[PDB]
């Protein structure tokens with residue numbers, strides 16, 4: 001399905017209605033499997049961090065470590081399929097120009113590639129952008145083949161503001177997710193008992209980032 005059709009007929013209405021949007025089969029099996037292979041290569045090559053410290057033990061060898069990350073621009077060697085994923089996400093957002101809320105999306109971050117090792121670690125409830133740092137849309141791509149939450153966990157639970165219910169999102173293979181980055185969508189990752197990969201990109205609203213930049217002022221010589 002073309003990016004423009006997807007954007008206008010589903011992503012825009014759904015984001016403006018619920019603030020959470022799921023697109024399944026975003027790139028197809030070939031592309032998705034190659035993305036998975038590139039991410040697994042990065043993991044094999046040691047490109048990831050050791051993971052977030054969850055419990056500090058006095059024998060530091062017994063310290064548990066959770067989500068590993070690596071930042072990917074999309075032009076590194078052996079990452080060109082990741083780059084095409086991000087150019088596709090960019091195409092989607094570009095076709096949504098001006099139609100998601102009142103935001104004018106003028107930029108994005110690098111890709112944060114996250115790897116939950118499958119050792120029972122999750123991610124605690126949080127808000128992506130709680131202090132108006134300019135990020136308005138969180139966009140995530142899941143690449144875990146035949147993931148069964150019932151067996152392996154790893155569900156992303158979003159707690160939409162003002163709604164009692166949850167929104168449970170399994171990290172399905174070739175799945176794309178959009179949600180507002182601010183207080184409207186607190187979320188957490190339930191414990192993962194298998195290796196769980198995700199690729200996240202945050203998109204910037206021009207005005208919010210422009211006035212956020214001031215706090216970064218601390219610059220031109222005199």
Ligand SMILES: O=C(O)CCC(=O)Nc1cc2ccccc2cn1
Pocket residue numbers: 114123126127128140156171187188189198
């Ligand atoms: O993998 C998913 O389904 C998304 C889970 C998630 O929220 N990861 C995450 C990771 C973060 C790492 C640093 C700062 C903010 C962060 C916000 N969110």
Ligand SMILES: [Fe+3]
Pocket residue numbers: 126127128187
């Ligand atoms: Fe998050």
